[PDB]
Design a protein around this ligand. Structure first.
Ligand SMILES: C[As](C)(=O)[O-]
Ligand SMILES: C[As](C)(=O)[O-]
Ligand SMILES: [Ca+2]
Ligand SMILES: [Ca+2]
Ligand SMILES: [Fe+3]
Ligand SMILES: [Fe+3]
Ligand SMILES: [Fe+3]
Ligand SMILES: [Fe+3]
Lengths: 82, 348, 353, 82
């Protein structure tokens, strides 16, 4: 959890699920709740990996409950290669 | 239950189509005669299993079988798994007719109904029976496969049935079948084109011939659906989208040999790996239809009609990326025994 | 519309098709009996694991002995007279048109498989039953192939013509009519395969006698379960059941493969039957014993409190067996010398009708 | 048309068609008129064969519409046998 991580994660979920900036996205906000199918979810992750240049095995891709839960795992993967 | 097959894991929905629309099909009875039934090959001109197999009535029978078996020696097991896989699918034919007969507007009301749909269903079923019989006798003669196990797997599948999730809507059903019939067209195209490379041009013909039949059926189904877009552009799109969200669940997906609990998945994985039927194809099958029916060019759909149309059009390139990704992250495939080939092992 | 007669036309059903004769209220009866079927009917299904399979009876293609095994199968098949093979191919073809029967069972109002994987006791039965019947087809099919005594191409063409053609047992979507029909129909194939088994045994092929004797074992199991449904319907609706039972017999149980066509013989079924009649595989005398068996099984004679034309219907059914048997005996006396005829199933070689 | 064949036919028509002796029968009453299915048509002739010691051939059987047309064919086959 840190502002810049949540930044691009908020932006990527917006850009993927076609939402204007007037649409609210908190750390605690959920994926299904924002109207995403199990397919949009895997696509969102696939964008993140291309945006951050690090990738997730799918054995950690099911715990993805919230932006917080998702932006949390990115900060543990970047604290590996960098 | 010590020996339980896989059951369908979703609440069964029935008669989702609004009862008024049954009329559409009554009105199109005489249309089907004119544009659909012509895609049936008159019985007299049809090939028969016997045409492709050893002739038991001639002296040459002993050598004929003997060669069949000698060429079959060279075909790698992993291929046989995918072949047995088709044979089993095809042999569960009763189900498909039974499914076609669940469809509201077109169901065979009596088992000998002179309606153009019931004529089609029965005549279509008759052409499909030959696929089963022919692969069956061939897989028997080869002696490469545990025929007892395969036959047990068929009983388990016909017991099990299938729910394509077509919900008695001929919209859903004919779209499903349109799709499904093309998959088996690409499927048998590859297996034919592969047996040819393995040096069995007699078995390549066998598969290529089934493919010829499957195209004809695919033509007639896409042609019904084409009409439904021309008549009910909204309902058809919405249905078309509905099917793809559910994902076309392959008819043989509750496959069970009494040993392997995810037998279908393992079978698929082998066809996936052999490039017989991939996820990339599922995409091209979907994309083909979107072009065939001109879903992109439809005019005057409803508020969520458009949402549905847009969804379908962008779905092919969407899968293909998800696909390509999975291949990169894809772990080393394990080896596994298959009861159809006496527990000999192949790579998934 | 605007039609004529085509060069290669199968025999169509020659009667106006009646549908949903059963009063829609009665669909409930079968919903109420869903849990009953689980308890009394599904138990007549042989768990898949304990079932025989075609492979069990045919040559094992996986072993070295295969070459001899086939070779013997063929040598014993040399001794079997053609007229028998006609009746055998006749069963094989009937059996192979299985899709139709499932399709017909699924026309029946109260019990039809609504989805193709419906978890109702009837849809479970129908599918499981169909699975057991598929084996009859496959096994006779492979055997008839290996024998090399029959024109397999013609047989296969005859099957395509029959599955195209379909059938109308005139069961009119009434599970009364249907289950009574099937009760009957399933016993006919019991007596039918009993005889063919017991005859192949005399022709010196005890392997083929087993093959037919085994199908018979299955058919009895089905017969049990069907008669058991209908017994329940007499216990619950003594009037409707009798009336239906009578209705079926008046129509006469038209055998499911009766629109048989090979593209050459226009009355191919009749000619096939005539040969089974003559071989004593399935006679008119049997049709009587099948009917009479049921009248005893369901206790139609002992039914109490039927309607005004319920009794007329009951009386009709009870006196029908001895009535047929006389008409039968008569026909044999006045019966003319049977002609000889070619059959495309056996390369146009001839047999006696 | 002699009144010993018309007499013996009446009894067999009544005993077969389940009609009480109260329904009056003449030599011109049809079988369809008296309420009978097609199976009965032969069954009626069936009795007469056993009750007259003569067999009517299948051929001349179908021509029959009434009692006179029937009881007439009995007269002929008793004349070239008795
Ligand atoms: C009868 As099929 C499963 O090949 O469409
Ligand atoms: C499948 As059957 C007509 O032999 O009961
Ligand atoms: Ca088959
Ligand atoms: Ca079969
Ligand atoms: Fe097929
Ligand atoms: Fe197909
Ligand atoms: Fe059977
Ligand atoms: Fe049966």
């Amino acid at each position: 959890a840190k502002k810049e991580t949540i930044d691009k994660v908020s932006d990527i979920v917006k850009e993927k699920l076609a939402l204007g900036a007037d649409v609210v996205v908190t750390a605690d906000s959920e994926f299904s709740k924002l109207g995403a199918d199990s397919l949009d979810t895997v696509e969102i992750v696939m964008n993140l990996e291309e945006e951050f240049g690090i990738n997730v095995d799918e054995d950690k891709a099911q715990d993805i409950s919230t932006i917080q839960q998702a932006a949390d795992v990115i900060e543990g993967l970047l604290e590996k290669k960098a | 239950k010590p020996f339980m097959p896989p059951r369908e894991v979703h609440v069964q929905v029935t008669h989702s189509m609004p009862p008024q629309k049954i009329e559409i099909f009554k009105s199109l009875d005489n249309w089907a005669e004119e544009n659909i039934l012509v895609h049936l090959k008159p019985v007299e001109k049809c090939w028969q299993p016997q045409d492709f197999l050893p002739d038991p009535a001639s002296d040459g029978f002993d050598e004929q079988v003997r060669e069949l078996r000698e060429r079959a020696k060279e075909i790698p097991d992993d291929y046989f798994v995918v072949l047995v896989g088709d044979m089993i699918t095809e042999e569960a034919l009763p189900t498909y007719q039974t499914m076609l007969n669940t469809l509201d507007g077109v169901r065979d009301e009596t088992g000998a109904s002179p309606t153009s749909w019931a004529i089609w269903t029965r005549a279509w079923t008759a052409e499909e029976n030959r696929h089963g019989d022919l692969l069956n006798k061939y897989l028997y003669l080869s002696g490469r496969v545990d025929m007892r196990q395969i036959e047990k797997t068929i009983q388990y599948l016909i017991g099990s049935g299938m729910d394509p999730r077509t919900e008695n809507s001929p919209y859903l059903g004919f779209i499903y079948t349109s799709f499904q019939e093309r998959a088996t067209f690409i499927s048998h195209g590859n297996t034919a084109r592969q047996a040819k490379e393995h040096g069995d041009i007699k078995l390549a013909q066998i598969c290529g011939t089934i493919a010829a039949d499957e195209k004809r059926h695919e033509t007639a189904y896409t042609k019904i659906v084409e009409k439904l877009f021309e008549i009910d552009p909204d309902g058809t799109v919405l249905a078309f989208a509905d099917m793809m969200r559910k994902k076309i669940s392959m008819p043989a997906h509750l496959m069970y040999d009494g040993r392997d609990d995810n037998l279908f998945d393992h079978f698929s994985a082998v066809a996936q790996r052999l490039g017989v039927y991939t996820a990339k194809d599922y995409a091209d099958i979907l994309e083909f239809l979107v072009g065939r029916w001109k879903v992109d060019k439809l005019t005057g759909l409803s508020a969520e009609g458009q949402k549905a149309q847009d969804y379908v059009c962008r779905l092919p390139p969407r899968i293909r990326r998800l696909e390509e990704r999975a291949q990169g992250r894809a772990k080393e495939a394990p080896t596994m025994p298959f009861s159809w080939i006496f527990d000999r092992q192949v790579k998934l």
